[PDB]
C-alpha cells in the first residue's frame, strides 16, 4: 500500500507545485517551479533479484526553472529589469552590504534618505564611480544614493543607460554620474535557495556570487521603465493541473484495490 501511497504523494506534490505557480502568476520577477520524480528500487542480500517490483515513486527535487519572463512597460524610470543573465543585489541593512540577496524584480523607489530601495524598504546595491572618472573605481558594492542637491542644484530627472549607470541632472544643468547598478550572476541558478518575496541567496549548490556590470561579459542589459512578470505559461499550468489529477486518481484506485485484497482475506 506504500507504493500506491507514494503515487498519491508524488501526484499531490505536482498539484502543490503547479498551484504555487498559478498563485504567483502576477508577482514580478517570479520563476516557476517543476516537480521531478525518481523511482525506488531496493534490494538486500536475502531478496529475490529476478522479480523486482518497484518501491514506488520518490520526489527527486522541485526545480526552479529560470527562463526569461515577459516584460511589462510602466514608463516609470525607477522600474528596472535585467534582460538576459544577472541579478539585482539587494541588502537588508544599509550599513552592512555584505548581507545581500539576489532578486529579479526592479520595482524601486527612493526613501526619505534618497536611497534607491525596493518595496520591502531594502537597499539596492551598486558600484561607486567618480563623477569625472569612467569605469568602476572600487568594485565593492554600496547602496546607491541619489542626492537631491548636488553642486547648488536640485535633482530633476534620473535615468539609467544600458551600462546600468545612474545619472541625475540638476537645476544648474550639471549631468553627474552617481554610480552603476551591480549585476550578480551564479554558475548554477537552480542551486539558489529560495527566501521570501521573490528573492534568492547563493548556496554551495549555486556557487559563489559573480559580480559584474550590465552588458559586460556574460551579463545581460539593464532597462529602466520595464518590469518582468512571472515566467509561467497559463495554458501549460492548467494542462499540468489536468494530468496531475489523472495520476492521483489512478493511484488512489490502486490504493483502493490493495485494501479490498486485505478485506478479502479478513473474511475467511
Partner 1 sequence: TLPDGNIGYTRNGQFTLNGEGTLVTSGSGYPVEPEIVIPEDAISITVGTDGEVSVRVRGQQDNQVVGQLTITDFVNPGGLEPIGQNLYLPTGASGDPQEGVPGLDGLGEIRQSMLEASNVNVTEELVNMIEAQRVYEMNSKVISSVDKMMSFVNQQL
Site for a second copy in 14-53 (CB under 8 A): 14-20, 22-28, 30, 33-42, 49-53
236 touching partner 1, by CB under 8 A: no
Site for partner 1 in 192-221 (CB under 8 A): 193, 202-208, 210, 217-218
Query: Between 2-23 and 234-265, two packed helices, what is the crossing angle to 10 degrees?
Result: 160
Strands (E), 104-152: 109-110, 116-117, 123-128, 138-143
Angle formed at CA 136 by CA 133 and CA 139, multiple of 5 degrees: 145
Task: Kindly identify the residues of this chain, within the stretch 126-185, that bind partner 1 according to CB under 8 A.
Answer: 185
Name the helix (H) or strand (E) containing 98.
Answer: none
Q: Which stretch binds partner 1 (CB under 8 A): 138-146, 166-174, 186-194, 231-239?
A: 186-194
**Residue 225, burial from CB neighbour count under 10 angstroms (0-12, 13-18, 19+):** middle
Q: How far apart are CA 12 and CA 21, in angstroms?
A: 14
Give the nearest distance from C-beta 148 to a second copy in angstroms.
Answer: 7
Binding of residue 228 to a second copy (CB under 8 A) = no
CB of 226 to partner 1, least distance (A): 20
Smallest distance from the beta carbon of 129 to a second copy, in angstroms? 18
Instruction: Annotate each residue in 40-79 with x if it binds partner 1 (CB under 8 A) or - if it does not, as one string.
Output: xxxxxxx--x--x-xx--x-xx-x----------------
Shortest CB 268 distance to partner 1, Å:
5
Q: Smaller CB distance to partner 1: residue 148 or 257?
A: 257
- Using CB under 8 A, which residues numbered 81 to 110 contact partner 1? 84-85, 99
Residue 89 burial class via C-beta count within 10 angstroms: exposed 0-12, middle 13-18, buried 19 and up: buried
43 vs 137 by CB, closer to partner 1 = 43
Burial of 13 (0-12, 13-18, 19+ CB in 10 A): middle
User: Under 8 Å CB-to-CB from 79, ≥6 apart: which residues?
Assistant: 106, 107, 108, 224, 225, 226, 227
Least spacing, CB of residue 119 vs partner 1, in Å? 13
DSSP annotation of 143:
E
| Nearest alpha carbon to residue 198 among 96, 107, 130, 94 | 107
Residue among 235 and 263 whose Cβ is closer to partner 1 = 263
Distance between CA atoms of 33 and 62, rounded to whole angstroms? Answer: 6
Stretch that binds a second copy, among 56-64, 94-102, 126-134, 172-180 (CB under 8 A): 56-64
Residues that bind partner 1 (CB under 8 A): 1-2, 5, 8-9, 12, 36, 38-46, 49, 52, 54-55, 58, 60-61, 63, 84-85, 99, 185, 187-188, 190-191, 193, 202-208, 210, 217-218, 246-247, 250, 253-255, 257, 259-266, 268
Amino acid at each position: 500500500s506504500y507504493v500506491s501511497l507514494s503515487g498519491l504523494s508524488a501526484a499531490q506534490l505536482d498539484l502543490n507545485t503547479t498551484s504555487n505557480n498559478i498563485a504567483n502568476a502576477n508577482t514580478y520577477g517570479f520563476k516557476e517551479s517543476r516537480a521531478e520524480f525518481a523511482d525506488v528500487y531496493s534490494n538486500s542480500l536475502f531478496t529475490n533479484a529476478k522479480t523486482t517490483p518497484g518501491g514506488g515513486a520518490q520526489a527527486s527535487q522541485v526545480a526552479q526553472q529560470f527562463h526569461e519572463g515577459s516584460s511589462i512597460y510602466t514608463n516609470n524610470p525607477m522600474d528596472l529589469r535585467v534582460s538576459g543573465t544577472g541579478f539585482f543585489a539587494v541588502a537588508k541593512e544599509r550599513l552592512t552590504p555584505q548581507q545581500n540577496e539576489l532578486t529579479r524584480n526592479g520595482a524601486f523607489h527612493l526613501n526619505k534618505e534618497n536611497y534607491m530601495v525596493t518595496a520591502n524598504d531594502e537597499f539596492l546595491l551598486g558600484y561607486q564611480v567618480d563623477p569625472s572618472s569612467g569605469e568602476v573605481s572600487s568594485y565593492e558594492p554600496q547602496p546607491i544614493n541619489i542626492p537631491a542637491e548636488f553642486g547648488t542644484g536640485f535633482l530633476t530627472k534620473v535615468d539609467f543607460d544600458e551600462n546600468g549607470s545612474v545619472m541625475g541632472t540638476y537645476s544648474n544643468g550639471e549631468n553627474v554620474t552617481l554610480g552603476r547598478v551591480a549585476l550578480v550572476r551564479v554558475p548554477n541558478e537552480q542551486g539558489l535557495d529560495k527566501k521570501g518575496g521573490t528573492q534568492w541567496d547563493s548556496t554551495q549548490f549555486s556557487g559563489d556570487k559573480i559580480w559584474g556590470e550590465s552588458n559586460k561579459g556574460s551579463f545581460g542589459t539593464i532597462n529602466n521603465g520595464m518590469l518582468e512578470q512571472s515566467n509561467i505559461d497559463m495554458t501549460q499550468e492548467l494542462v499540468d493541473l489536468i494530468s496531475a489529477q489523472r495520476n492521483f486518481q489512478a493511484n488512489s484506485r490502486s490504493l483502493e484495490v490493495h485494501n479490498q485484497l486485505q478485506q478479502n482475506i479478513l473474511q475467511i
